[PDB]
Design a protein around this ligand. Structure first.
Ligand SMILES: Cc1ccc2[nH]cc(CCN)c2c1
Ligand SMILES: Cc1ccc2[nH]cc(CCN)c2c1
Lengths: 98, 103
């Protein structure tokens, strides 16, 4: 309670700042300021996890061998993808597989 | 194997740019909020929200490090990492952040 609203406004403030950074072509330096190298790497790898989960060809073990992501990391990704709204999942199939 | 792989560094960078482009396009069709719930943890989202306030108060230059720690619950190492990163930011970014964050 209470703090949850505080955190939500703080998160939306970031979302809006980055929204406007993309509009002004400052998104790349903004994301270098706001994220660590390891965090950027994780996000690049999470995209590939989403891609290969949507593609449906690799087992969890095969996805681990390809990406270096452990079984628990892949399971986190699968559970998050199952939780995503349908419209996002359908769009991701289009953007990441074609 | 190379002591330092420039090839792997660039491959990782392309993976990062793929995310950046994915999120750019999600902003254009109002899928950015669900995309960020998919791609980030709650703790990571909270950290990003807190980092915005660290930048704001560092640019403002008013609060001490003790005041910033007390206000945000952010250790000295966290405040220092943000100050160091602010030092590496390009002038165009710092000027824009001043315009947007400082009223
Ligand atoms: C796709 C994917 C793969 C691994 C992951 N680890 C943590 C997250 C954030 C969950 N909202 C994640 C997402
Ligand atoms: C502004 C701020 C505050 C605290 C932080 N901790 C880690 C980072 C990412 C560094 N590029 C960061 C940025």
């Amino acid at each position: 309670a209470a703090m949850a609203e505080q955190r939500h406004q703080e998160w939306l403030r970031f979302v809006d700042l980055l929204k406007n950074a993309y509009q002004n072509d400052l998104h790349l330096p903004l994301l270098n300021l706001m994220l660590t190298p390891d965090e950027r790497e994780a996000l690049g790898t999470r995209v590939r996890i989403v891609e290969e989960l949507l593609r449906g060809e690799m087992s969890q073990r095969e996805l681990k061998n390809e990406l270096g992501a452990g079984i628990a990391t892949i399971t986190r990704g699968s559970n998050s993808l199952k939780a995503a709204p349908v419209e996002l999942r359908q769009w991701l199939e289009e953007v990441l597989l074609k």
